[PDB]
Amino acid sequence: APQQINDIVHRTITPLIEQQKIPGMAVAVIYQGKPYYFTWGYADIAKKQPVTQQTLFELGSVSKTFTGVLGGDAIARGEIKLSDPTTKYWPELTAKQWNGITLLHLATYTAGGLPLQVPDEVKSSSDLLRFYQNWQPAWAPGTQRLYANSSIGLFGALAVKPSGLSFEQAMQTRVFQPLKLNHTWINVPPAEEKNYAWGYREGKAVHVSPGALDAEAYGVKSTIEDMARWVQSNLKPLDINEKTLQQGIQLAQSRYWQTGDMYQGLGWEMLDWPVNPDSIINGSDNLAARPVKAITPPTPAVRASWVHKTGATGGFGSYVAFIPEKELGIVMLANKNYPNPARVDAAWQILNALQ
Numbered sequence: 001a002p003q004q005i006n007d008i009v010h011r012t013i014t015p016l017i018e019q020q021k022i023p024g025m026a027v028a029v030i031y032q033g034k035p036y037y038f039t040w041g042y043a044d045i046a047k048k049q050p051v052t053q054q055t056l057f058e059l060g061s062v063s064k065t066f067t068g069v070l071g072g073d074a075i076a077r078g079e080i081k082l083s084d085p086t087t088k089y090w091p092e093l094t095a096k097q098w099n100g101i102t103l104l105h106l107a108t109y110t111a112g113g114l115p116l117q118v119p120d121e122v123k124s125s126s127d128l129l130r131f132y133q134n135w136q137p138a139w140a141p142g143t144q145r146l147y148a149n150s151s152i153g154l155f156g157a158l159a160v161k162p163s164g165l166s167f168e169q170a171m172q173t174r175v176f177q178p179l180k181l182n183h184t185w186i187n188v189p190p191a192e193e194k195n196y197a198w199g200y201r202e203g204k205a206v207h208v209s210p211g212a213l214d215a216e217a218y219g220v221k222s223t224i225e226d227m228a229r230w231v232q233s234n235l236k237p238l239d240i241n242e243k244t245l246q247q248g249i250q251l252a253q254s255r256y257w258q259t260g261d262m263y264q265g266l267g268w269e270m271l272d273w274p275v276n277p278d279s280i281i282n283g284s285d286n287l288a289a290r291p292v293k294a295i296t297p298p299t300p301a302v303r304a305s306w307v308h309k310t311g312a313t314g315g316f317g318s319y320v321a322f323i324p325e326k327e328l329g330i331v332m333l334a335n336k337n338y339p340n341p342a343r344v345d346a347a348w349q350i351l352n353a354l355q
């Protein structure tokens with residue numbers, strides 16, 4: 001527990017929790033490949049349960065990094081190809097607007113305007129089919145990026161079809177188990193309920209509600225220890241023994257499209273390191289439609305990158321960022337959804353000091 005790490009973390013996070021009124025928080029800093037943990041406050045205010053290294057937090061969109069990597073693993077296994085048309089894995093999707101929309105477009109939010117959220121009205125398989133069949137794109141595929149759960153959520157669901165495994169089974173067997181993420185879940189089991197923190201929205205305790213493609217877009221819950229391990233795995237994929245998983249991690253950090261100074265990966269988003277903090281901080285502020293330049297062909301994962309992902313739910317706020325070249329990373333999990341810029345700012349202050 002180097003004093004430098006202790007000091008920068010505490011000096012940065014304490015003020016943050018005070019200003020944002022965060023009930024509880026966990027932070028992990030990966031320095032030279034090793035993890036250091038920090039916790040504050042409560043996982044359950046009413047029951048006075050403190051946040052610990054075993055507390056589970058809802059990751060929200062950070063879940064998309066798991067989906068991107070699982071998809072990458074499927075490509076490495078030769079089960080799917082990002083160049084495959086969406087209809088190859090969903091024959092029922094016969095509507096003409098789908099011609100030319102590939103799994104790559106789904107995975108990177110470039111299908112042409114798929115909506116941010118799948119309608120809360122969608123509550124069945126036929127309902128989901130109708131939703132996608134009736135969706136009218138605003139742009140041709142591969143021209144504009146519009147962040148969307150309905151886009152990467154569908155990618156995740158189709159990517160696992162060849163395996164015959166459910167999305168949860170595939171995630172558990174192909175990603176969580178190999179990486180020893182034994183306290184990371186799509187559905188929190190009863191055995192872990194005691195560790196599942198409550199999220200707080202306007203002072204009320206809340207957990208994420210069920211929704212279509214929730215598993216694929218925002219369904220993961222994890223501990224600060226497992227997320228530290230997730231960061232280490234993504235920082236140094238060559239240390240991973242499962243060949244297709246190592247390759248899937250590499251594919252998820254490849255640069256497929258560029259918008260401004262950001263590059264879109266599978267789930268992960270990247271910028272060249274060194275980065276202009278104002279670029280990532282103001283850049284993380286909440287989702288617009290932005291034209292994209294295709295990187296043809298995609299650039300394999302660049303070590304000198306600031307790789308990150310912000311995530312939230314009604315009652316949680318999370319952020320992950322790492323720099324492969326420096327063997328440095330950070331994970332910030334909180335049970336209150338606070339402004340993205342504040343998370344990025346604190347994360348940059350910490351990593352910049354340690355770099």
Ligand SMILES: O=C(O)c1sccc1S(=O)(=O)Nc1ccc(Cl)cc1
Nearest residue numbers: 060061149217218310311312313314
């Ligand atoms: O996680 C995020 O940051 C964002 S941003 C826009 C959508 C998302 S998400 O769908 O993945 N996460 C999310 C956020 C709020 C609620 Cl109530 C439920 C899920």
